[PDB]
Structure formats: structure tokens, C-alpha cells
Design an enzyme around this catalytic site. Sequence first.
Site, PDB file in Angstrom:
ATOM      1  N   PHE A 171       0.724  -1.340   0.099  1.00 29.82           N
ATOM      2  CA  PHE A 171      -0.028   0.077  -0.091  1.00 29.82           C
ATOM      3  C   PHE A 171       0.841   1.246  -0.050  1.00 29.82           C
ATOM      4  O   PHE A 171       1.673   1.585   1.081  1.00 29.82           O
ATOM      5  CB  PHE A 171      -0.768   0.073   1.226  1.00 29.82           C
TER       6      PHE A 171
ATOM      7  N   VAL B  35       5.545   0.130   2.607  1.00 31.84           N
ATOM      8  CA  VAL B  35       6.218   0.596   1.632  1.00 31.84           C
ATOM      9  C   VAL B  35       7.318   1.436   2.110  1.00 31.84           C
ATOM     10  O   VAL B  35       8.337   1.647   1.491  1.00 31.84           O
ATOM     11  CB  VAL B  35       5.247   1.401   0.739  1.00 31.84           C
TER      12      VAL B  35
ATOM     13  N   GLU C 101      -2.423  -5.092  13.583  1.00 32.45           N
ATOM     14  CA  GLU C 101      -1.424  -5.932  14.288  1.00 32.45           C
ATOM     15  C   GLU C 101      -1.924  -6.797  15.444  1.00 32.45           C
ATOM     16  O   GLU C 101      -1.360  -7.796  15.982  1.00 32.45           O
ATOM     17  CB  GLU C 101       0.045  -5.186  14.582  1.00 32.45           C
TER      18      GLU C 101
END
Length: 266
Positions: free
Chosen positions: A50, A133, A224
Amino acid sequence: PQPKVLTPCRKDVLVVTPWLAPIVWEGTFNIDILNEQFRLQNTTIGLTVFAIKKYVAFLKLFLETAEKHFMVGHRVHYYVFTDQPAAVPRVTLGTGRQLSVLEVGSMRRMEMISDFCERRFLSEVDYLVCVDVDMEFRDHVGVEILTPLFGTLHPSFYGSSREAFTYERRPQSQAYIPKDEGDFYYMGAFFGGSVQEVQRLTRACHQAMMVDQANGIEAVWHDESHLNKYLLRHKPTKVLSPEYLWDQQLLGWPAVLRKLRFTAVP
């Protein structure tokens, strides 16, 4: 080099989990052997990322450095999810490697992988690797990671006790893990597996985040937190050491890390 049953190559680290999944450290694998095995199957790995808003600025280095270090010699399919397709840099790719740009208009990351893109992944790749990213590759990241399902040891917690883990602790949330349960603390930013198992995990994580939401609760580390609940219930078949997710500026370079492979960009 002949493996010697009475000399372990790594004595400083846990190299296998209590359910007999390998923990992947330098010196535990012969990459030549692994490469052969995955090459014989013509393995294709998908790498998803992303890049939204200002995070498109990270694509050039992420991509450049992926060509250098990631699954080199294997087929690779980068999937770049972005809101600015025009801002995706043109990086020249090695043979057998391709990139798709996937345009989008929290938990939509999990949604996109599991729902919208399900059929596409199933036909195009054998495995999916899901990373952030704002990173670069600095050393080999290869087929040693591939397995039905993996997570990665969060780098500020590998050396710690579980009550210290920043699991979700409120029972009202689906990601709830009690004070006395839990194997490791896995990083939300580097996971994968076979496409089937990656869609299972992201389907489950979405489904669980929808529930917390319908109840006005949000897990303390968001995706997470749900990842960690998933991986508690469905144990990963390999666990990657912190070699595979490091921040050198915050943690330095300890001797126990013989290579730093994939790191945060300063």
C-alpha cells in the site's frame, strides 16, 4: 557444507518454535538447496504494498531495492495499491518480474487482499508477501521465507516476556489475548504464506475488525492486534527472525543480527 548433527551452526538463538516451525536466521539455511526446490515448482511470489497519499514517495527505493534483493531468480508479481497511479515510478524490472498498479478511491488493507482481489491472487501467484512501503531491502530476502503461513518477530520485542507484549488485553475486543497466553509478538508489517492461507488470515482479520467496530471498540495496535490473535490460534509454519524487519536508527545492529535484510527508511 555437510550438516553436522553435533555442531549446531547457531547456538545463540532459538531456531525452531515449540510447534516445530523453523525460525529463519542467517546460518540456518542453504539457499542453494531452497532455490532448487522452489525453482522446480516454477514458484511465483506476489509482493503487495500500500502506497497512499505521501507514501507513494517511498515506492522508488522500495522497488529498486526489491529488484536487487527480493526473490531474485524467481517469478515475482508486485501489486501496488495506490490512490495515485500516475505517481508510481517506472522501475526497470528483471526478467520474470512484473508490476501491477491497483487503484483505490484502516482495515481496508485486510479487506482489499481477502475480498476485492481474491480470484486475481489465486490465479496469478503461489504465495503472497504483505509488507509496508516505507522500507528498503538491504540484504537477501528469499524463498527461505516461503511456507503456508509466516509471521515475523517484532524487533522491539523478540527479547522480551509475554506480559510485556502489547497484545489486546480488553476482553470486549475480538483480538483479546489473556495475560498468560501467547507465543511471540508478531509484526503487523511483514507477513504472508500461500494465497489460500493469506486469504484465510485476512478474511478472519477483517471479520474480527468488523465486529470490534460494530461494538465501538478498536484494538490497541489495530491490524497487528488481530494478526497476533490469528497467529496464536493458527500457528505460523515459519517465523522470520528480526533480520527480516529492523530499524537500524532505533536499535542499531546487534551481533545476534548477522544481516539486516529489510529495514525502515530514516
